[PDB]
């Protein structure tokens, strides 16, 4: 439904409004079972198990620096966007890195 | 080799060779014309980059690609690795009079 404003009127009016059942997209339909038919070949989209978006505090268990020093780190992991990480230099500093 | 649809396969080596030959012919013409130095300089930069990508692509941090955003297969990439000539066609190879 497309509204059209008029210019010289104050902020927010209507000249006309036109609506029309516009066609957009063909979405494949899941059959009665769970299989799609995509080009005549019957496909199945399996569920995926990924790390949940959020924030996680991990640490390599002294895998580096050979001192037994645990280098704690944090990841802010969005669902969609650019990641964010904080970590510790073996000198007990604190550095950020992006993507 | 034809793809059986009237067109031909990509065959990345010929693509790299066409790139190099095109830049080289253009630079030869532009050197014949005594063009100003700012133009011939980046022409020679382009030619150096093209021959670079022909001999060994990906040894620069930048690699040029065709389809699917993977870099092309250069003449050094046809020798290296598990799929080069040495490990896939010379040390061990497919054999006639054989069954399974």
């Amino acid at each position: 439904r497309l509204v059209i404003y008029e210019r010289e009127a104050p902020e927010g009016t209507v000249k006309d409004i036109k609506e029309q059942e516009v066609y957009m997209g063909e979405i494949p339909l899941m059959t009665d079972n769970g299989t799609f038919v995509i080009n005549g070949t019957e496909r199945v989209i399996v569920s995926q198990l990924h790390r949940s978006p959020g924030v996680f505090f991990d640490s390599d268990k002294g895998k580096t620096h050979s001192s037994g020093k645990v280098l704690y780190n944090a990841r802010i992991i969005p669902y969609r966007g650019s990641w964010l990480d904080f970590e510790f230099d073996p000198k007990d500093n604190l550095f950020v890195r992006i993507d | 080799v034809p793809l059986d649809g009237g067109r031909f396969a990509t065959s990345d080596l010929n693509d790299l060779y066409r790139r190099v030959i095109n830049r080289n012919n253009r630079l030869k013409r532009l050197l014949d014309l005594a063009a100003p130095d700012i133009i011939v300089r980046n022409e020679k930069r382009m030619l150096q980059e093209a021959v670079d990508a022909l001999l060994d692509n990906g040894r620069r941090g930048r690699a040029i690609t065709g389809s699917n955003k993977r870099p092309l297969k250069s003449l050094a990439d046809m020798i290296k690795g598990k799929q080069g000539r040495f490990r896939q066609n010379l040390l061990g190879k497919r054999v006639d009079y054989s069954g399974r």
């Binding site: 063909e26 070949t41 989209i45 995926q48 198990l49 | -």
Partner: protein, 49 residues
């Protein structure tokens, strides 16, 4: 239509149905792949995952 046909047709998680059983179909639909986009890689996954 392009962004949807690309996902349904050619993805890593839209795969050809195993169909030599009723069991194979019904246990390939209830599959939990830990791979695909936004996930780990087959030959670079350690002993702990």
């Amino acid at each position: 239509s392009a962004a949807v046909k690309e996902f349904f047709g050619s993805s890593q998680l839209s795969q050809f149905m195993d169909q030599n059983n009723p069991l194979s179909e019904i246990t390939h639909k209830r599959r939990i792949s830990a791979l695909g986009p936004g996930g780990l890689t087959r030959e670079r996954a350690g002993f702990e995952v």
